[PDB]
């Protein structure tokens, strides 16, 4: 996949949401984002950002003698799997939006 002309007018969250949805057209177990983090005008640290897919890997990485997610009382309409699906999609959209803002400013 090749996304281009992202920076023509400006970067919005809906744009990164559509890019994240085209990343949702594939169903991976992780997402890796490579971008340059705008620390200063001279230093731009390259950053790898990882988004774990919800019931495929996200619960599995937190299963540490029990779980690390059991402390949270899920106040959603449906189960923890769907709130993790929505949270992983929202985390991917936010990471992607921030990645292409950091990379554009650097």
């Amino acid at each position: 996949l090749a996304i281009a002309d992202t920076y023509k007018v400006r970067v919005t969250f809906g744009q990164a949401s559509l890019i994240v949805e085209e990343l949702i057209k594939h169903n991976p177990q992780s997402y890796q984002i490579l971008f340059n983090k705008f620390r200063s005008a001279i230093s731009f640290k390259p950053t790898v950002a990882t988004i774990l897919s919800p019931d495929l890997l996200e619960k599995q990485l937190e299963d540490v003698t029990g779980n690390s997610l059991d402390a949270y009382d899920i106040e959603a309409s449906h189960e923890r799997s769907d709130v993790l699906r929505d949270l992983t999609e929202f985390h991917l959209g936010v990471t992607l939006y921030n990645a292409m803002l950091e990379n554009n400013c650097s």
Binding site: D5, F13, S17, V20, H78
Partner: protein, 72 residues
């Protein structure tokens, strides 16, 4: 086929549902603020899947009112 909330059983991702709600909130703002909120609504990019490493068909986006409410 699917199971869950009303967007997940309609074939809609959570990002599209939340962006639809955010666009509908941006539409009902005051005119000092809705004109500024017109800026964060425009989607302008283009994607092209690369099945071979050299070519692929293209789909562009020139949207101004927000995310498409209809399914794509």
């Amino acid at each position: 086929a699917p199971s869950g909330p009303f967007y997940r059983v309609a074939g809609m991702s959570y990002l599209r549902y939340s962006n639809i709600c955010a666009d509908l909130l941006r539409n009902v703002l005051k005119e000092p603020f809705k004109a500024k909120a017109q800026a964060r609504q425009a989607i302008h990019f283009r994607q092209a899947p690369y099945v071979d490493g050299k070519a692929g068909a293209s789909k562009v986006y020139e949207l101004e009112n927000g995310i498409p409410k209809t399914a794509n």
